[PDB]
Structure formats: structure tokens, C-alpha cells
Symmetry: C3
Subunit: 316 residues, 3 copies
Amino acid sequence: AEREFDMTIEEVTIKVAPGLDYKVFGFNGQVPGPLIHVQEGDDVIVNVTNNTSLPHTIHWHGVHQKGTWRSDGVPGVTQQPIEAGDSYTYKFKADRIGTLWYHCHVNVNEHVGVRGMWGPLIVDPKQPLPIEKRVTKDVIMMMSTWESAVADKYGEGGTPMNVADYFSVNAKSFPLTQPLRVKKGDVVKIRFFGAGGGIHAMHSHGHDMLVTHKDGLPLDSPYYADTVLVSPGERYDVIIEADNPGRFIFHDHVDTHVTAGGKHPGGPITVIEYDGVPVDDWYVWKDKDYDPNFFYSESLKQGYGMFDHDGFKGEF
Amino acid sequence: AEREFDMTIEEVTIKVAPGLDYKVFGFNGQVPGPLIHVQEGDDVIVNVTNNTSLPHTIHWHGVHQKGTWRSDGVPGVTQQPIEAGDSYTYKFKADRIGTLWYHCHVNVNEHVGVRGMWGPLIVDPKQPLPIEKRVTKDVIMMMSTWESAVADKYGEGGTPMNVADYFSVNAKSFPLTQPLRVKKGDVVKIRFFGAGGGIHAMHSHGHDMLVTHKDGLPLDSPYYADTVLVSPGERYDVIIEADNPGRFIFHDHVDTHVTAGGKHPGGPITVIEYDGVPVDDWYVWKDKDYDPNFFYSESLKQGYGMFDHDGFKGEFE
Amino acid sequence: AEREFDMTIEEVTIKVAPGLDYKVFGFNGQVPGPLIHVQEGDDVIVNVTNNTSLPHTIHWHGVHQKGTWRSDGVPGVTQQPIEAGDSYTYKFKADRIGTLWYHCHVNVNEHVGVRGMWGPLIVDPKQPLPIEKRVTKDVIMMMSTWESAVADKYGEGGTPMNVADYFSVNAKSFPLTQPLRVKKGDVVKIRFFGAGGGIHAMHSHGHDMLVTHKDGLPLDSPYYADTVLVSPGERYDVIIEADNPGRFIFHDHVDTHVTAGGKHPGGPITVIEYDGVPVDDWYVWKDKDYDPNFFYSESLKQGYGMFDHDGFKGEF
Ligand SMILES: [Cl-]
Ligand SMILES: [Cu+2]
Ligand SMILES: [Cu+2]
Ligand SMILES: [Cu+2]
Ligand SMILES: [Cu+2]
Ligand SMILES: [Cu+2]
Ligand SMILES: [Cu+2]
């Protein structure tokens, strides 16, 4: 089917951690960018308007661009950049399946590294794996890093001379992340993305993960892991069988990454919270204002197209 | 079988490198912590006493805690911390097989990153791989990094603003590491752990490694490597066939990691020394003061239980 | 067969980037060092003469040194160093197949980290994979990093206290790299090397990579990837089916690595350029002064031996 979407690029500010507001270039004014969810074989048309003061593009990472290389989104290679105030239309066929993503390809070190110019592109295969047919909850986790020194400073950051001192999943640092709420018997598909410039060692307490896909494509030899290393550009899909009721923390195991501006705890941390587990008064998230779509789990159930999320929207 | 162990957490100082003494929180006053070696299906009880000035927990990394999540050892999630001077008992069934480990889960960036709060937990499968039944030597290598600026200062370190300038296997930096001594025909199982906050590219000269397990679980498709990348939290088990007599260096291939305080050589370096090879006068480790249990290989032959090692023990104040 | 080669170590200066010349110890006065290409079972002899002011060795990474451990090239372990002005002969049997490499093993943090003391060693199996039979182009990509503060001064660099601020493939930083020119129907073997001290996430636009070998040895279970993480010491061989005509960028996806001295663009970046695709006026590499052997692809067709390349030579 033909899938036509309109995206904008906006100058907005988001809250990454307590005390850290960050100026970003948000697709549809949000970080992560909108979820794009389509079927294998769909013809995609994206009309992009640049409402920022700088040039950008959108590269569709994982999309082959078979006979459509001029929609690959690389400035000086496949197109001239999209200048401030201008528009550009991308057209491609979604013939590559799985967990893909999209991001700006101008000034990548800054724009993708610290300005949040990325989002998920999920292409449903015609032939999912047997285990994928058992999935009851689909979870998107996009990891990135932030340099507090350039929080207020478009045009700076993302160099070896900068210090990445905050770390996140879906643009939040713990405790501003959200729990992953499950029920006993759930079969959870988690899609990890190396969105930023860091490496993340994602570890699930209480469960092993079956690693089923690398960069969206199914492995002939899937393998179990309790810690999955995710590096820039990569995606890994795993399955967790939710067969062990408790509260089980789930986080980046890189020691310096569980900090926020030099203090602990912070970073890419969530908790696998099973329904019906009694809540102790000392539980860190006992009074959580819950967002059920923090990992796009609700949007992933609502059909094919483009999905904004109010929780990811920044302020103008 | 029910296996009950008593462990303490102690404030001690260890020698990581020549000219680098480091204040740590050592399980039983040592880094690495004691080897815990049990069988699949055992019921494990660990009574922990905190003899330090700061709160800690023990998380059992790889242990599912099937129906025992309150023993997972995570502060503010599964328990309140073990305060200074207090005790706490962990109970869990070892139903997850393989190379596991344990570490503190309080102030992790510092306690695990630079205070040596970790040790190995080996769970023997009831049905090991055929290749594991050929093994004649079992070897534990726990890699970590150290920040010299906070060596003498509990309560600091483990942040992006600190500089990790020393590197180790089993808490020692070359030349204070020990050789891996083998003889022709040995079948060596090596278990790599990303214990600290660094990434380590472990390269064996003279041999390929058959990578057989990831995080303790056997791969359906094992593969050969001469360099295995080990990142925080991960474990890899490999097999080396010791069929090539020589002196073969075995080290972290990350260029900056073969230094110590800006000087070279240093870092996670050992040598696979074959017994039959005549020793040259210029060999760096000629007349080495040898510790046969530096990789826990002797402890791993002594049956199920918990094993301290004096080679790893630190000095009390 | 017995194959005997003569190599020197020279003090030369290479151009790594615009704004970065670098003092290096080049094998045969070039970085990367000469391609050594032999067949499984060959008896290799390399006579090395040290024409520099400092001691060196050559370690043959991946070579087992079966019955020849004294040729392993490790100072204080298998030999005393090759002192300034002296010579030394290595002899070994190439019984280990695949993508290997060689590098100095004296003061490795500096000499391999920033002085370019490395090159490729390719051992052809007597029995190649079926997949390798279809290969029409062979490509070598050796990634490394550079510290500008020590560009002029042998005896410093390669420590945690230094800043790596330039990044390269085959010792050039974009735009001084070269395109990978292919024709539709090509089957391209790419051999990635972690030659320096960095981690590199190599991402091919427009194509998936079939990962066929790890450290030169064939995987029982090959897998597709669009991003391949290459760390120090490692090699990965991949196959790309050149079935998608366009201009497709091919680069390190680690955000900070696509910079040069704090500026973007730079780093390990090439472009898969298909023959016959019209060149746009704004294409960054329009009228490029092209080197068809920048990835050793021409040398790799010339049989067994040691092959220098003028494009890699430094100046005295
Ligand atoms: Cl022997
Ligand atoms: Cu942009
Ligand atoms: Cu891409
Ligand atoms: Cu602790
Ligand atoms: Cu854990
Ligand atoms: Cu050298
Ligand atoms: Cu080697």
C-alpha cells in the first residue's frame, strides 16, 4: 500500500534529566521522532519541511533505496541539503524488513549525537518468525548520550573534545524513564537501537534475552544473552518470556553510564514490573506517573503509518 | 544440595600496579572476590556481613531469581541497602547454568567501576558440552579499569569526568599479573568477564579460541576467534587447544589499555607459557614468583564451595 | 612454496587529513604497510631492516607460529627488539588461513596506535568458501585513529590522557579517502581491520553486508548486518552484492568519528560509486583524483607476494 506522511523539523527543548533541559531539532517537535510503522513492500512518501534555522536531511537507515538512491538523504552525495524553511519529498519502497530507523545526515556528529534527530522505522515482514507471532508487547528502546556543556548551544557538540555526561533511553535519564510493565505470560519483543554516539551494554535482571535479529534481519542461529552490547547504528531484537514475577531492573551495564552529570543513579535504566507484585514503601517508583507508550508499545498496536507521542514533545 | 556460605565486605588496600595501591571494598577482603562454585539446581544461601563504612548489596548477575526476586540485590527495587555493620541473607536456586558473577549494586559506577566489588559464580551444568568434558584447565579472567586520581578516596570516581589510566586482569596490571602455565595436550577453558566499566579486546597469540558460551549459555553455533571483545556485564567462555608449544602473550588489544599511568608496558597481559619450552635469560618473567591460582585454576579443581585466595587479598588499615 | 620478502622500517611523514601531517614508522615507508599475500601452507621468510631511530618488532597477528614461536615478534617474550639500524629474519608457515595482519609489538600503544606500524597479511585457503568463488572485487579497509598533539614527536602518544581527534580508513580521513568504484553485478569482499585503538561501526548505505568471516575464519552461521562493529585486533570479512546502482556512502557510524580536529565532515568515509550513475554538479567527489588501489583491490589481483603502493608512501 501507499503510505504518505508529512514530517516537520522543529527547534524545541526537551527535559532529558532533572536539571537538564536540552535544545534539540525534533522531528515533529519530539524526541524520539515519530514512529513510522509499515508493511514489507509498502510504498512510502515522506514530505519534510524544515522549520529550523539550519540545513538537514533524513536518511532512512536500513532502507536499500532500490532504484531510489536519490532518496537516501545524504548531503553532497544523494541530494543538496534541505535548507532552513524549505521542503523535500522522500519516496522509497519498504522492501527491507525489520527494525530500521531514520536520522538526519547533516552535521551528524552534532545533529544525531546530541540534537535528537532520530526515530524508529519498523517494517513488518510478510513472514514473521514463529516466536514473533507469540509476541504480546513490542518495545522500542533508543539509546543515546548527551553533553550538558552544549545543551543550550546549537552548532556545538559531538566532538572528541566534548564530554558525554548524561545517558538515556528514549531521551530520558532515570528516574525520568518509565517502567516496562508486564504480566506473567507476556512475550516481550524488545528492539534496541544505538541512536547516539555511545556503546550500551543492556542487561535484563531476572530473565535471559533470546537475540533473534541483528539490524532488523533474523539470525539463522539466535542465541541467549543476559547482556547485549549495542553500538552506534546497530539494532538488536530480543525476546523475553515474562515468566518470573517480580521487580527486575533493566539497564545499561556500562558503569559510567548509570550516572547523570557525575551523580548516581541516572542513565538508561528501567524496571520490568510485573502486575500483581506487592509494592514496598521504599520502592523508588511506587508513585510513578505512568506513560504506557514510553516504549511506543501502544502505537505499535494501532496500524500502519506515522505516530506522534505527546510524552516525547518538546517546548518551543 | 543446600550450600550455605558466609561472606563479609571489608575495607582493604590492594596493589594493582607498581606504584598504584588502591582502596577497595573487597568481598572477604579480596579482589576478585571469592570463587563460588556450585552445581545446577543447588539451593544457595549467602549470609553477608558489611564490615565497611558504606552501604552495599550483592546482585547475582545471571541468576534468574525464579520466585526469589527479593534476593536480586538491587537497592530501592528488591531491597533496602545493607547498611554499615549490618547483615543480610540471600537465598536462591542455581537453576541458571554457566559462568555467572556477583557484584555490589549500590553506587555501581564507583563500587563496581573502581572498588573491586565483584567475583565469579560458576554453576556447573548437569549436562556439560562434550568439549567441556575434555577440559584439563579452567581459567577465570575478570577485566576491569582503575582511576588513579581516586585511589585513596572512597566516595569518588566512576564518572565520565574521571580518567581510567590503569587496566587489569584479576585486579593486577602487568608485570604483577601471572603467567598461564600449560603443557602440550592441555585443553584450556577460559572464562572472560567484563567486570569493570571498560571494553577489552582479548587476543591470544599462537592459538585460536573456540567461543562456546555467551553469558554462560552454550552457543548453538560456536565460532573461532583470535580476538574476543568483552564489554561490561558480559561473559564469554572459550576453549584453547594447547597444541603449540612456545611462550605466547595473551592480552587486551585495545592500544591504550596496555599502559599503566601513561607508561608502557602495563595492563591486562599474561603469557601462555608451555612447560617444555626452555627459558631464555632475557625472558621478562624468568624466575617469576609464581601463583598457580591467579586465574582460580586450582580452586576450580577443589569441588563445590566458596574459595578465598590469598593472592587476591588486600591489606587492612 | 617458500616465499622470501625484504621489508624496511622507515621514518616518514604522511598526510592523514587536510590540516594533519603525521610522523610515522612506515613499513617500506608507507602506511598501510605493504600487502603480503600468500597461500595456505607457504613457508614465509621476511627479512626486516630497521632504518629508524627506535627499536621495533613485527608480530604476525593470526599466524599460529606452529614450531616457530621465536618468530612471533614479541619483545622480552619471543625475541629481543630489532634495534635501530639492525636487521632480523622472521620465518613461519602460513598454516592459518584468511584475513590476518602484522604490526609492531614494541611500545604498541604508540607504535600501532598512532605511528602506522601495521599492514595486511592475506592467506588464501587451498579450499575457499563457495561464497568467495563469486567474488569479483576484494577490498581492504584498515581503521585507525590519530592524536594531533603528538603528530610531530616520536616517543609520545597512545595513552588515556591523549585525545584521539582524527580518524581514518587506510590512513586517510575524508575527503582524502577514495571512493569504492563498482559496477552492477559485482560481488565485493570487504575485509575490515581494527588496526588502531578505536572501535568503528562500519555502515554501508544501500546494501546489507553478509558477515562471512571472523578474524579470517569462516563462520558456520553467517549473518546479515548493515552495521559491523570492528574493535582493536579484530577482522571481519563481508560480502556485498552490488545490485543497487547509485552513490551510497559507507562510513564509521560512531558519531564523534566523522569529524577531523573538531570539524565535520571527516573520518572513515567512502562512497560506493556505481559505474554509469550520472555525476551531479554538487557531488562532493566530482572530478576526484582517483586511486583504484586505495583499498588494495588491484594489488589483490596480482598473485602471491609483497606489494607496495605509491599512494600510501610517506615523505622523508
Ligand atoms: Cl609443553
Ligand atoms: Cu540535522
Ligand atoms: Cu544508513
Ligand atoms: Cu557497594
Ligand atoms: Cu544482573
Ligand atoms: Cu615499533
Ligand atoms: Cu597477535
